[PDB]
Amino acid sequence: VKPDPPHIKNLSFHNDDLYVQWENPQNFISRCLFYEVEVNNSQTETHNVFYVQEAKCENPEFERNVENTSCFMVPGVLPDTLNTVRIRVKTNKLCYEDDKLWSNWSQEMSI
């Protein structure tokens, strides 16, 4: 009946201060946001638009698996022509309660 609560990975009580290391999967983001991508070329003489659910940098291409980076397949682009890309971020209507995103709290114990 209740969502999965936050999870403490590590703690440190250092000079009267608490430093908490939370396991952060960012599910609240992953489930609400998505990208809408617009591609224009000359073949393709009309604006092609697609949606992105996963922006994960896994592979197994000769690229990278690092952080501070996002990966996604862009259909409609041809290497021989000039193409213009334009991205937008859109929210998921299912995440809203009384027109408010991420509307609620969560319950945890530090002991």
Partner: peptide, 11 residues
């Protein structure tokens, strides 16, 4: 209804 298996957020 729907569920997001990641955090079991159900609507």
């Amino acid at each position: 209804g729907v569920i997001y298996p990641g955090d079991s957020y159900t609507r």
